[PDB]
Write an enzyme that holds these catalytic residues in place. Structure first.
Site, PDB file in Angstrom:
ATOM      1  N   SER A  50       0.797  -1.234   0.000  1.00 31.76           N
ATOM      2  CA  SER A  50       0.000   0.000   0.000  1.00 31.76           C
ATOM      3  C   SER A  50       0.830   1.286   0.000  1.00 31.76           C
ATOM      4  CB  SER A  50      -1.005   0.037   1.160  1.00 31.76           C
ATOM      5  OG  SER A  50      -1.939  -1.041   1.107  1.00 31.76           O
ATOM      6  N   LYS A  53       0.599   3.533  -2.963  1.00 28.51           N
ATOM      7  CA  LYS A  53      -0.532   4.434  -3.142  1.00 28.51           C
ATOM      8  C   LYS A  53      -0.114   5.903  -3.145  1.00 28.51           C
ATOM      9  CE  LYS A  53      -3.944   1.414  -0.996  1.00 28.51           C
ATOM     10  NZ  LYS A  53      -3.776   0.877  -2.368  1.00 28.51           N
ATOM     11  N   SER A  97      -6.884   2.521   2.807  1.00 22.58           N
ATOM     12  CA  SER A  97      -6.023   1.630   2.043  1.00 22.58           C
ATOM     13  C   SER A  97      -6.891   0.815   1.060  1.00 22.58           C
ATOM     14  CB  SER A  97      -5.254   0.740   3.018  1.00 22.58           C
ATOM     15  OG  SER A  97      -3.918   0.572   2.597  1.00 22.58           O
ATOM     16  N   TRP A 190       1.003  -3.548   3.864  1.00 19.72           N
ATOM     17  CA  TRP A 190       1.093  -4.956   4.254  1.00 19.72           C
ATOM     18  C   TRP A 190       0.972  -5.802   2.995  1.00 19.72           C
ATOM     19  CZ3 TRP A 190      -1.964  -7.167   9.115  1.00 19.72           C
ATOM     20  CH2 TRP A 190      -1.598  -8.518   9.312  1.00 19.72           C
ATOM     21  N   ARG A 230       2.623  -2.256  13.766  1.00 20.08           N
ATOM     22  CA  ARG A 230       3.398  -1.352  12.936  1.00 20.08           C
ATOM     23  C   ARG A 230       3.358   0.054  13.506  1.00 20.08           C
ATOM     24  NH1 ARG A 230       0.498  -2.525   7.350  1.00 20.08           N
ATOM     25  NH2 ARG A 230      -1.120  -1.993   8.883  1.00 20.08           N
TER      26      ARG A 230
HETATM   27  C1  LIG Z   1      -2.192  -2.318   1.417  1.00 23.99           C
HETATM   28  O1  LIG Z   1      -1.024  -2.715   1.413  1.00 23.99           O
HETATM   29  C2  LIG Z   1      -3.185  -3.465   1.206  1.00 23.99           C
HETATM   30  C3  LIG Z   1      -3.478  -3.929  -0.001  1.00 23.99           C
HETATM   31  C4  LIG Z   1      -4.342  -4.936   0.119  1.00 23.99           C
HETATM   32  C5  LIG Z   1      -4.944  -5.725  -0.852  1.00 23.99           C
HETATM   33  C6  LIG Z   1      -5.835  -6.734  -0.496  1.00 23.99           C
HETATM   34  C7  LIG Z   1      -6.466  -7.561  -1.630  1.00 23.99           C
HETATM   35  N1  LIG Z   1      -7.400  -8.429  -1.245  1.00 23.99           N
HETATM   36  O2  LIG Z   1      -6.112  -7.406  -2.802  1.00 23.99           O
HETATM   37  C8  LIG Z   1      -6.129  -6.968   0.855  1.00 23.99           C
HETATM   38  C9  LIG Z   1      -5.528  -6.188   1.849  1.00 23.99           C
HETATM   39  N2  LIG Z   1      -4.626  -5.155   1.484  1.00 23.99           N
HETATM   40  C10 LIG Z   1      -3.874  -4.195   2.173  1.00 23.99           C
HETATM   41  N3  LIG Z   1      -3.796  -4.030   3.496  1.00 23.99           N
HETATM   42  C11 LIG Z   1      -4.735  -3.208   4.278  1.00 23.99           C
HETATM   43  C12 LIG Z   1      -5.892  -4.095   4.744  1.00 23.99           C
HETATM   44  O3  LIG Z   1      -6.809  -3.554   5.420  1.00 23.99           O
HETATM   45  O4  LIG Z   1      -5.805  -5.312   4.452  1.00 23.99           O
HETATM   46  C13 LIG Z   1      -4.035  -2.556   5.512  1.00 23.99           C
HETATM   47  C14 LIG Z   1      -3.991  -3.486   6.752  1.00 23.99           C
HETATM   48  C15 LIG Z   1      -4.847  -1.270   5.834  1.00 23.99           C
HETATM   49  O5  LIG Z   1      -5.116  -0.855   7.201  1.00 23.99           O
HETATM   50  C16 LIG Z   1      -5.039   0.517   7.241  1.00 23.99           C
HETATM   51  N4  LIG Z   1      -4.256   1.084   8.168  1.00 23.99           N
HETATM   52  O6  LIG Z   1      -5.667   1.178   6.403  1.00 23.99           O
HETATM   53  S1  LIG Z   1      -2.297  -2.081   5.107  1.00 23.99           S
HETATM   54  O7  LIG Z   1      -1.702  -1.297   6.247  1.00 23.99           O
HETATM   55  O8  LIG Z   1      -2.239  -1.317   3.884  1.00 23.99           O
END
Ligand SMILES: *C(=O)c1cc2cc(C(N)=O)ccn2c1N[C@@H](C(=O)O)[C@](C)(COC(N)=O)S(=O)O
Length: 244
Positions: A50, A53, A97, A190, A230
């Site tokens: 992410s 982005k 995200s 992540w 994190r």
């Molecule tokens: C970001 O890295 C992210 C991308 C994705 C994609 C998918 C998918 N199914 O294609 C699933 C989960 N993904 C991400 N992570 C976020 C999430 O909620 O799963 C993340 C944990 C967001 O939480 C916040 N802080 O917004 S991460 O930190 O980006």
């Protein structure tokens, strides 16, 4: 008055407590400092996840693929999370995200303009492959924690090759915390579709006196690991060092 040894040991223990391996790079002026319990991670390559982005938003906005007020409408198909099943702006999608929005923006930009723009800002290994809508999640794009702080540093100081107003538009999307006069601007990441999984939190602290201290936390995520470690580890490390 606190020894350097104590600082290093304190931050090592935050990663040890979380039962993971990670590093946090801090940059003050031109000087990089590496903390954590796996210092060798600092120059190793990981998918940006992410954290891409931020750059996706800069590219999309420079090239007029979107405005900051434009509403990306939920198409009604089931998304990974209920929170993503709504109509949102880029800024809202950044806070959530919300990948579906950023994939839509990636598609508007298109592969050729994306490859050109990622090369032009010289982000990570700069290889985006042939799929415009997932290169930042599963490869081939990779970036080191050192390159990430440098990117955060560039963005925070408006040094990226984009209009000043483009960079201000994206920076405004990134505020995640206020700690009495100090503002934390960061993007979490992540990479779940990769082994081992990688966690990121990249950004900067803007202090009351206007000084900006860029950081990048990079760690290994497991199953059942909570996303907000994190953040916990980052805040604890920034506080330990008196940065906040
Ligand atoms: C970001 O890295 C992210 C991308 C994705 C994609 C998918 C998918 N199914 O294609 C699933 C989960 N993904 C991400 N992570 C976020 C999430 O909620 O799963 C993340 C944990 C967001 O939480 C916040 N802080 O917004 S991460 O930190 O980006």
């Amino acid at each position: 008055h606190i020894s350097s040894q104590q600082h290093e040991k304190a931050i090592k223990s935050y990663f040890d407590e979380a039962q993971t391996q990670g590093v946090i790079i801090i940059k003050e002026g031109k000087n990089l400092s590496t903390y954590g319990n796996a210092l060798a991670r600092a120059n190793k390559e990981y998918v940006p996840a992410s954290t891409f982005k931020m750059l996706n938003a800069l590219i999309g906005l420079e090239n007029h693929k979107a405005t900051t007020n434009e509403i990306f409408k939920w198409d009604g198909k089931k998304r990974t999370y209920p929170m993503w099943e709504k109509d949102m702006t880029l800024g809202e999608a950044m806070a959530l995200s919300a990948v579906p929005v950023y994939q839509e923006l990636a598609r508007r930009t298109g592969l050729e303009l994306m490859q050109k723009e990622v090369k032009r800002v010289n982000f990570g290994n700069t290889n985006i492959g042939t799929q415009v809508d997932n290169f930042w999640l599963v490869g081939p794009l990779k970036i080191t924690p050192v390159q990430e702080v440098n990117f955060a540093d560039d963005l925070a100081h408006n040094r990226l090759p984009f209009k000043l107003e483009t960079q201000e538009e994206v920076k405004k999307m990134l505020l995640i915390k206020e700690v009495n006069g100090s503002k934390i601007y960061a993007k979490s990441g992540w990479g779940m579709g990769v082994t081992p999984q990688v966690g990121w939190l990249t950004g900067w602290v803007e202090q009351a006196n206007g000084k900006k201290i860029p950081f990048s936390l990079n760690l290994e995520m497991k199953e059942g690991m909570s996303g907000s470690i994190r953040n916990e580890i980052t805040y604890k490390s920034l506080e330990n060092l008196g940065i906040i």
